[PDB]
Amino acid sequence: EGVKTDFGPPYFRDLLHPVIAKNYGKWKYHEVVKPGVIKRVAESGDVIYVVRFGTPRLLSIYTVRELCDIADKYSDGYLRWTSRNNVEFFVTDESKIDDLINEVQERVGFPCGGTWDAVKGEYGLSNIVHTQGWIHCHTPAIDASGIVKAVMDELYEYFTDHKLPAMCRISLACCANMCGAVHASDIAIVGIHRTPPIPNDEAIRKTCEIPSTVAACPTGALKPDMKNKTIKVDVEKCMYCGNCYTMCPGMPLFDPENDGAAIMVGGKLSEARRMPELSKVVVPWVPNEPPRWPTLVKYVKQILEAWAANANKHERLIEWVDRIGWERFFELTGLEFTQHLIDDYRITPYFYSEFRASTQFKW
């Protein structure tokens, strides 16, 4: 016998809603009824209603069972999540759509919304993709779950409606190794340090493999100390990425007062209208202010409300910038351009800017 291994996840096809299983790869068109409700008509003529809700991502198993109770009812015991950590139900009988929407709100407190209609041209804010934060991670500069709650509270109304002229993605990373699509979002919140690491010589000797710690620094600020058998850090060359702390517990760069978040904009993943773009820093640093992070929230709101105001139907934030330029962008958003925003990261090769970072090309 022995403990069975190497069997993988369940086969997805066994976990499909019957109407979905039958009409697989055979749909005619979709239709957004109202915000949070999307209709899908099959080539067979069958009609199923997908219904989307915001989740905190982090779920109690009890808030899981309680979703399964709802699932058996409105949706034949079938269910799914999204790529942005929303939850979607599948209702056949369209009279029981609102019942679902209401029961969900009273049972678990999960708002209906998170959708968008490109056809008409009206968009809603979807969930924020984020990570662990102080809940579980050993190298964060900020905490995801908290800021997410604080931001979405302010910008709730946007998730619930289609009040936006184009698609806006808000995403978050708790440190520089930027987990999630954070480097490619319309608005990004990125945990940064602003303080170099003070080496712990004792902790390094016993635990740290030095040569790979030294090799993992992108600016070369680290040099092996032969003596001594420790690491030396050139403060002039450190930009507080904290990669050395990832590699070595003897290299903390943590300072509660100076750690914070940068805000980046102008990212894009889809091909539609224009090419994918990496996010760009437009606010160097805002403080950690648990629990409401009011400075962060105000600056995200400020930015989003600026682009919302000006942007033409479909025109995303980076597309807006394409049109007005960064000169007018910094004015309207009311942000200041400092030297911190001039790229100085030496190691990335120029030739990457010449590669096709897109599926867009002619045959």
Partner: protein, 417 residues
Amino acid sequence: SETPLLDELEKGPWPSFVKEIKKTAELMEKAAAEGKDVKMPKGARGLLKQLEISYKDKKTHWKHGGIVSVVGYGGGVIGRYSDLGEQIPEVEHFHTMRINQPSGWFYSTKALRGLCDVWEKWGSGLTNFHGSTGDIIFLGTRSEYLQPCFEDLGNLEIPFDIGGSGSDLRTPSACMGPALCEFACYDTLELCYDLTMTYQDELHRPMWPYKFKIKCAGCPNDCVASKARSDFAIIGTWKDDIKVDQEAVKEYASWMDIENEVVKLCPTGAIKWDGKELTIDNRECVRCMHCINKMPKALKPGDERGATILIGGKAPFVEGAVIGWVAVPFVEVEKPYDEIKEILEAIWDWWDEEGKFRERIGELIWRKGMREFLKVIGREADVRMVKAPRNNPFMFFEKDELKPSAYTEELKKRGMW
């Protein structure tokens, strides 16, 4: 008020995570007091008390992880310890388990309940739905519980395996694709699972210089952020013409501003509308999706389907953040996917043989050059791989491309060349 700073975040309209954590501990302690087989009822409370201290301190309270796993596997379990280990005993070990999600995150209620049963028993009752990569996150358990927990997950009527972590093939993910989406250019969910199954060993037993991720997107809309979030982004596309029902377009123009909201927005001017006919120059089309996005009843992807492969996508670490670039302009997606597998293996053989410690595939290509990368995958250089030819004349030439000369014979004579 035990937790004054966290309680402020139970307020507000957005679903509170603080509410989620409280809801867990309270019911887990309610279960354990009722004689239930709960090994960690104290788990979620201690987590809340530590997070409360972290909010006060404005710093993490988790230290570096003493490595841990299950029998047979090397990855899938991430070790974590609290530096308040003695003050809050129940979070001295709070290890995460990554549970392989079903392709496209589809679930029946049973499957989910099964997961809850095992985790209530062996863990903190705290989960993430879903993790960034796509895995189910079992958040917080001890070292000697890992082994029995894995036994039982596999013995469930709907059984789940462990996902990928460390220097392995990570758990692949895929957009909803053909399960829900009329845009799908190929069966994303089948491809995701087939891959996950084919390279089980490379996922569970990390052997590579670093991590490697694969994400499958139904169409160029990239609904799983594959180009940014994976080393190997398999994105659906087509070769022939966008299929256009002309009457359906008249149904739009009855109300829609097709000239402004479609025509003028097409990157390459390929799409024309005069009031009667819509015309698409598929020679000029870059299959950006917008027009199909605009008029999904009317417009559709072509019949000749497959995928473009974008290589390199990664977060900034070491050499810089990467949105994947074009590696294979077109490849067929048909079971058992031999053409895609042949590619992946060739890349892995090469990356294992040549990759430095903690070097991502994209950094390796950068270091080695596309010429080497292309010969490894056995493909020709193609103008579609670049946004523009090189802006300097510093080209490497292969030995065999040179005219034989007095000089090349000189090089030969000395064993260089």
